[PDB]
Structures are given as C-alpha cells and as structure tokens.
Write an enzyme that holds these catalytic residues in place. Structure first.
Site, mmCIF file in Angstrom:
data_model
loop_
_atom_site.group_PDB
_atom_site.id
_atom_site.type_symbol
_atom_site.label_atom_id
_atom_site.label_comp_id
_atom_site.label_asym_id
_atom_site.label_seq_id
_atom_site.Cartn_x
_atom_site.Cartn_y
_atom_site.Cartn_z
ATOM 1 N N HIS A 94 0.852 -1.174 0.000
ATOM 2 C CA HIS A 94 0.000 0.000 0.000
ATOM 3 C C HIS A 94 0.903 1.245 0.000
ATOM 4 O O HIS A 94 2.062 1.199 0.421
ATOM 5 C CB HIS A 94 -0.929 -0.110 1.230
ATOM 6 C CG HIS A 94 -1.825 1.067 1.493
ATOM 7 N ND1 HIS A 94 -1.374 2.299 1.917
ATOM 8 C CD2 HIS A 94 -3.178 1.158 1.448
ATOM 9 C CE1 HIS A 94 -2.407 3.106 2.094
ATOM 10 N NE2 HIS A 94 -3.513 2.441 1.807
ATOM 11 N N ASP B 225 3.509 -4.590 7.722
ATOM 12 C CA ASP B 225 2.235 -3.897 7.557
ATOM 13 C C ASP B 225 1.141 -4.943 7.724
ATOM 14 O O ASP B 225 0.886 -5.748 6.829
ATOM 15 C CB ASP B 225 2.178 -3.207 6.195
ATOM 16 C CG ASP B 225 0.866 -2.479 5.946
ATOM 17 O OD1 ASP B 225 -0.110 -2.644 6.721
ATOM 18 O OD2 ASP B 225 0.803 -1.734 4.941
ATOM 19 N N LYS C 46 -10.144 -1.148 10.534
ATOM 20 C CA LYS C 46 -10.299 -2.306 9.654
ATOM 21 C C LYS C 46 -10.628 -3.583 10.415
ATOM 22 O O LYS C 46 -10.874 -4.627 9.792
ATOM 23 C CB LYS C 46 -9.044 -2.510 8.815
ATOM 24 C CG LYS C 46 -9.000 -1.542 7.635
ATOM 25 C CD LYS C 46 -7.678 -1.569 6.923
ATOM 26 C CE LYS C 46 -7.556 -0.374 5.966
ATOM 27 N NZ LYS C 46 -6.280 -0.411 5.220
ATOM 28 N N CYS D 193 -5.000 2.518 -3.511
ATOM 29 C CA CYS D 193 -3.778 2.983 -2.881
ATOM 30 C C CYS D 193 -2.621 1.975 -3.042
ATOM 31 O O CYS D 193 -1.744 1.817 -2.207
ATOM 32 C CB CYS D 193 -3.976 3.299 -1.379
ATOM 33 S SG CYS D 193 -5.091 4.635 -1.072
ATOM 34 N N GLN E 241 -4.171 -5.496 6.828
ATOM 35 C CA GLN E 241 -5.129 -6.412 6.214
ATOM 36 C C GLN E 241 -5.067 -7.815 6.816
ATOM 37 O O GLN E 241 -5.927 -8.651 6.507
ATOM 38 C CB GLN E 241 -4.878 -6.478 4.697
ATOM 39 C CG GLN E 241 -5.824 -7.333 3.861
ATOM 40 C CD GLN E 241 -7.240 -6.811 3.729
ATOM 41 O OE1 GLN E 241 -7.596 -5.765 4.262
ATOM 42 N NE2 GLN E 241 -8.076 -7.588 3.044
HETATM 43 C C1 LIG Z 1 -5.664 0.375 4.198
HETATM 44 C C2 LIG Z 1 -4.290 -0.163 4.456
HETATM 45 C C3 LIG Z 1 -3.275 0.687 4.879
HETATM 46 C C4 LIG Z 1 -3.603 2.107 5.307
HETATM 47 O O1 LIG Z 1 -4.391 2.125 6.479
HETATM 48 P P1 LIG Z 1 -4.861 3.538 7.091
HETATM 49 O O2 LIG Z 1 -5.726 3.180 8.265
HETATM 50 O O3 LIG Z 1 -5.662 4.238 6.001
HETATM 51 O O4 LIG Z 1 -3.628 4.331 7.439
HETATM 52 C C5 LIG Z 1 -1.966 0.234 4.916
HETATM 53 N N1 LIG Z 1 -1.632 -1.062 4.520
HETATM 54 C C6 LIG Z 1 -2.639 -1.903 4.104
HETATM 55 C C7 LIG Z 1 -2.289 -3.311 3.678
HETATM 56 C C8 LIG Z 1 -3.958 -1.463 4.049
HETATM 57 O O5 LIG Z 1 -4.946 -2.307 3.627
#
Ligand SMILES: *Cc1c(COP(=O)(O)O)cnc(C)c1O
Ligand SMILES: *Cc1c(COP(=O)(O)O)cnc(C)c1O
Lengths: 415, 415
Positions: A127, A204, A230, A370, A207
């Site tokens: 992302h 990260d 999320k 994104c 997800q």
């Molecule tokens: C949506 C997402 C982000 C960004 O998250 P935010 O809450 O908008 O900062 C970063 N990495 C992944 C894999 C995402 O799905």
C-alpha cells in the site's frame, strides 16, 4: 464447496450486531477492506467513555488513565505480545492509523539504522503508506529502495526473497496480506532472511489483523502496524508494536507534551516507551473503544471468524469465476484470498461497474486502492475490489453477482 | 463585581447539556484547560456518524465525504477564514491534536524556510508542543532558538518584541493564550514585526479558540493550530489553518495513502491542499463531531460564552486573593486571565493540594502543565492550576475555595 459450507454462509449469525446493517437490510457492504462496519458495543463504548470518565490525580483522570492501560493490554494479547504470561502493554504505541505508524517507523528506524548504500526492501504489493515513507527516508539517508516481485501465482518466492534481501539490506518492510490480491505473504520466512542479513523486519498488518491470527512472537518481526478501523474498531486509532529493546533505541518521532520526562529552554529528556512516541492529548475514547472491539472479536472467537471468512472468500471467487466477462486480478483459487478479491468487468471501467452496483445497493471499491505500483506491475490502471467480512453472507455475494450481470447487460459486448 | 454579575454566575444555564456533569452533580470540574467536558449532542454526533454513514462512489462514502467538507467549512467560519463570503474550507487541515499540527509546521515550514543562522522566535510561555519541535528543527537546520521574555505583569512588551524579532528571524511561533498564566498575547502586533523582518507567523491557539474570538484574517498569522477537545469537541481531532499560498509551497509532512495524486515505484505526485497533509484514513466521525461542537458553540453564542467566562475568571481570581496563604502564579487581576489561573498554597506541594481537593470533589491540575521552561523562569517547580469554562458556576469556585481552606487547615502553618 459442500452443502454444509454453503448452508453455513447462507446463515448470518453476526450481522445483527451492526446497527448500520440492521438499519439498511438491502445493502451488501463488500468494502470491509477499506473500513469495517462498527459493532453496537464499540460505538457505545466510545460514547460511554465521554459520558463517564472524560479527562486528560482526580478520579476521572485516574479512570481514563486505567482505561488506556487496559486497552493496551487487550491489544497486546490479541497480537500475541505476551511474556509471567503478562501482556507486553508497554510495547504498544497508538497512532491515528497504520499510515502514521509506518511514517513513524520509516523516520525513526530509518534515522537510527540507515547508512548510505544500505538497502530498504519492500514488496511490489505494498500500500502507498508502506511505499512513500521509504522513498522519502531513502533519499534523505542515501539508502536504496529495492522491490520484491511476484510470480505468476501472485506470490513472493523463496528464490526472490534470497535474491533481493542481501547483505546490504538494513530494513525490510512487507505487507502481511495484500489489500488488493488477498495474498498472504510468508512474513516469518522473510523475517528469517532479513535477520540473517543484519536487517530489521517491519510488517504492515493492516489487512491481516482483521482476518488471521497475528502473533508477533511467531512472525519474528521487529515492528508491526495495523488500523483499528479495519477490525471493527473506531476510526482515528492505529497500533504500532515493536520489540522493547528496539523501541528504546529508536529516536522520538513527534515531540512535545506528554512524551517528555523534563524540558528546558534548549533541550528535553524523553519519557519511557510507549509515551516517548505519543505526543500531546491522545484519543482516549477511541483507544477505549478499540479495546472494546478486541473484546468483541474475542467473544465471537477469531477462529470462527476466520473459518467463516474463508468460506465467504471461496464462495466469492467461485461465483466470480462463473462470469466469463470478469477478469480476476489475482489468484483464481478462493483459498488464496484473505478478505480481498480484485477484478474487472472486461471492457468496462470500474467507475461504471461500481455505479451500477451502488444502484443495486452493493458497495465495492473502484480505482487503484492505494496500490498504484502494484496495478502498474499488473498492467492495470484501475480495478474493482470486493472484500468480505464475517458479517457478510452468501446473499451479499449473490447480490454482487446479480449486479455484475446487470453491468454486462448494460455495458457488455451486446451493446 | 456587581450584584448582577454575581447573580449571573450563580445561575448556570449550560451545565445540563453535559451528561457527565448532570450525572455527577457534586463535582466541580475546574480543569477545562486540560480538556473540555462533552455536550450530549457532540457525543451523539459521533455515534450517529458510525450508525448511519460509516465508510472511507457508493452512498455511505459520498455521505462521509460530504460530512468532512461540511465540518471543514464550519471550522473555517468559526475562526474567520472566509472569502463570495465562502468559508476557506480548503485551508483547514486535520491532525490528532495541536501537538501534531505544530510538529507538522515545524518540519514542513522549517524545511521550507529555515537557513543556517536564521532565528526561530518563541515565547517563554509556550507549551512543550510549541517548544520541542523548534528545538529539533533548529538543530537540523542550523537555526537559532530565541525566546520572548515577560515583564513583571506577565506580559510581552512591545520593546521585547522589537528587541528579539530582528532581521535574522525567519519563523516566529507564539501562544495566543498561555495555558498557565491565562495571559492573552498581542499576536497581531507580534505578527506585524515578524512580517516586517521577513519571517512567518505561527500561532498556538489551543487556549484561545475555546474562549475568545479567533479571526485568522485579523490576527495576520500565516499558520494557526488548536485542539477540538479543548472546545467541547471530541479527542483525536486537531486543526491547522494556513494561508493558501503558503500551504501550497510547504512540503508534505506524513506521506502515504490519500495524500497523493499518483505514485510510482520511485516517486509520487502530491494531492492538492488539504489532502496533501492528511495521510491515510482520517477520523471522519471525530471530524463530524467537531463540526457538531462548532454548531453547538455557535448556538450558545461565543460572545455570551466569553462574557460568562470573563465573570467566572474575575470571581475565581478575586476569591483566591482573599486567601493570604495562596500565591497566584500570574496576574492578580481577574480580567488578565483567559480561562486559566495557576496558584500555589504556600508551603504545600500541589500534589497534596490536588489530593485534598479531589476528596472534596474538585478537579484541578498539579504539576508543570507541560510548560516547564515557564515554571523554571518563574522559579517554580510545580503549581496548581484551576481553569473555568462557561459550564462552571459560582458554586464550583466556592467549592474550590472551601477545599483550599481545608488544605490550609491540614497542611498549613498551624501544623
Ligand atoms: C488500508 C491499508 C493501509 C492504510 O491504512 P490507514 O488506516 O488508512 O492508514 C496500509 N496497509 C494496508 C495493507 C492497508 O490495507
Ligand atoms: C494543551 C495545549 C497544547 C497541547 O494540546 P494537545 O491537544 O494536547 O496537543 C498546546 N498549546 C497550548 C497553549 C495548550 O493549552
């Protein structure tokens, strides 16, 4: 998919907990990869905080302080950050979102560790928030940005890991689960090579935290970030976990009130971790409601959530494969998708697909999600994206499929 | 204070709007300078967002997008950022708090404007969040940090302004109202000298926005920041306003999703202002509830709020002056205090004062209030601080005074 599995996803034991879904029974919300819907108890937990313990030595302040600590512990236990058996609550740092956590890491870990000529390795699946902070710190430090690439099954191979993560690597940052492909990367295997090469491992998990077991000790990462919104929590709350010794070594990011121990006109002494990384008044009510979301998920059992979401992902991919005018941008196997399935209707722009779907009360995302470098790598300028959560059911997915048949009737070959 | 004025503050037409105050009728909350209590409608506005338009082209997303824009416009109008007569909504940037806004300004405006040998001028009254970011960027850029000092009436004189803000000045950042002294600084006059010297004017309005008219066009500042949670809004929301041409010139702070127009593997094109400064998923529900707080305050009329808070400040200072064992750390004139009155009980540590006050259901703050360089300048290591808001009344203040008499009976000279 067996009859029993189809019956399980036809039933929906969870959607009634979500006021917006109960109030909008016609809507098929298939965009949880963008943000979750909110359980009633999480919405109310935030309001209760403000109604009963709102403060920044008197009782409401003591009470707000204890609420933050209890949420930190719940979050730590949720991601396996436990000693004893005590939660590693002091290794939990709050931000606004994953994006701010990754900017913090890139700035602080980058200043701490990167020398000119070092490599920062990320994946082509990242992302934007796990891309541009690395572009920036690489330019500032003289480091080189390196990309892990995919094979024809949308995976990163062991051969690619060994080829791109070499002795020059100093930081490696990789998504646990792609928000476009739904691919689950082998973070533990990447971490092993990263560490062999004298580099730090950043994950990260935005997800993965909503969908699959996240255990920071088993993943062997040094830092890991995700977003509460999320995983059925409020907006405004991100989480960064880090190894205790590394967070101590890393310099502060934001500076000012609350992250100090003492201040003079010319200098400052920093507070201990995690306050060292939390500048100014924090969103105590959002933190509190994030703890409520964790408790809510624990009560449902993440193993049952994952089993149900696996069946929904399989059904979604299966049904999309029956539409020959749909191109799935990703694996054609449903079990290779955690949460997200990207696709296009051949010859139709995603904006038009999503518009027709919205008229049919189906919510999807259209665009680059994104992850533009990923789409460029895949020779796409935009796709649709449908994503599933445990509060979805078979009927939501059938509604999507019926909507896509309407799209094909309106924009397809016959026209 | 006339009989009519005393009667006005004995009446309390506002406290019933605050659920925590109605639920805790014995409590005298005199720490609004740390954070406000929440009106019912602001708490409910946040929950309503989550219940009815929670999303990050489909309807809930269109709806959440329009809610953010409408709150930006309300905020802009509240601080006088208006064209036409249209709100300058695109000059309104959201952060978590004033502290993050000031870090953003110090990093972005500092990189943009500061050359080695330049001066950054702040006041000795600054909160830590308007100090340490300047310490940091000064070290990074070769600039010098300069302090505006006070006279014996706790004011910054015109002579001091001209002496310290000279041709080397490049950025000047000053608090509109001190969170310790309650002194209102002549920001417009400081801005005039700042601009004559070729420097930019930054205003910390965290303690003015809740209490006095803030008009960015009349103040002549280039950038101005405040926190929603100090003006009856939710936690988690800060506001930065800036001149349009300057925000365009300034580089991004956080990078990643949502603040771009396009991204490649190696670079990025930034989105327009204000999205350029907002990385990742924003707290849409908090933004929405911040708009609700603005509407709430407008409905009460800020002129009536200010008149009432002026009378409460005068009464607080008057009553503290009747206690000879109390030392007011600041002006002995109530009309020289916007909101905050710092004080000590002579010979008693503020932790002990606050503890006794809490047993008497009075909430104050004890410590350095995140303004340690100010306390050092004043030869204090800690003080008490009582602060007033329109939802306080005469009885709250009398409760404080009775509590301080109890403190003197327990810890005073007779013991
Ligand atoms: C949506 C997402 C982000 C960004 O998250 P935010 O809450 O908008 O900062 C970063 N990495 C992944 C894999 C995402 O799905
Ligand atoms: C409290 C305050 C700040 C810090 O505000 P946060 O919301 O905690 O970031 C900055 N300046 C002044 C004058 C303050 O009173």
């Amino acid at each position: 998919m067996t009859d029993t599995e189809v019956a399980q996803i036809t039933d929906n034991p969870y959607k009634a907990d979500f006021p917006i879904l109960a109030a909008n029974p016609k809507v098929a919300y298939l965009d949880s990869a963008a943000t979750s819907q909110r359980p009633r108890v999480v919405i109310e937990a935030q309001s209760r905080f403000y109604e009963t313990m709102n403060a920044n030595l008197y009782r409401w302040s003591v009470d707000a302080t204890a609420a933050i600590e209890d949420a930190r512990a719940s979050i730590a236990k949720f991601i396996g950050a436990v000693d004893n058996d005590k939660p590693e609550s002091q290794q939990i740092i709050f931000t606004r979102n994953t994006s701010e956590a990754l900017n913090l890491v890139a700035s602080s870990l980058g200043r701490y560790a990167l020398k000119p000529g070092d490599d920062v390795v990320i994946s082509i699946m990242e992302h934007h928030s796990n891309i541009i902070p690395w572009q920036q710190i690489c330019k500032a430090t003289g480091a080189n940005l390196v990309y892990l690439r995919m094979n024809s099954q949308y995976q990163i191979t062991p051969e690619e890991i060994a080829s791109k993560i070499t002795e020059r690597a100093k930081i490696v940052s990789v998504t646990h689960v792609s928000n476009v492909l739904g691919t689950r990367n082998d973070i533990k295997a990447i971490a092993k090579r990263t560490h062999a090469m004298g580099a730090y491992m950043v994950v990260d998990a935005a997800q993965s935290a909503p969908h699959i077991l996240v255990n920071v000790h088993d993943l062997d990462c040094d830092l890991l970030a995700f977003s509460a919104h999320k995983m059925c929590g409020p907006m405004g709350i991100g989480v960064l976990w880090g190894r205790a010794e590394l967070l101590n070594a890393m310099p502060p990011f934001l500076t000012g009130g609350e992250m100090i121990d003492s201040v003079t006109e010319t200098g400052a002494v920093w507070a201990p971790v995690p306050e060292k990384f939390e500048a100014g008044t924090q969103d105590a009510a959002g933190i509190y409601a994030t703890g409520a979301a964790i408790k809510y998920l624990n009560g449902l059992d993440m193993a049952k959530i994952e089993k149900r979401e696996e069946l929904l992902a399989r059904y979604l991919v299966q049904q999309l494969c029956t539409l020959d005018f749909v191109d799935i941008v990703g694996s054609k196997l449903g079990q290779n998708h955690v949460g997200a399935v990207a696709f296009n209707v051949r010859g139709v722009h995603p904006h038009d697909v999503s518009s027709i779907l919205d008229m049919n009360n189906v919510c999807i995302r259209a665009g680059h999600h994104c992850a533009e470098p990923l789409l460029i790598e895949l020779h796409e300028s935009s796709t649709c994206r449908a994503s599933v959560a445990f509060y979805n059911d078979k009927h939501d997915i059938d509604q999507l499929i019926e909507g896509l048949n309407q799209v094909w009737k309106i924009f397809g070959s016959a026209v």
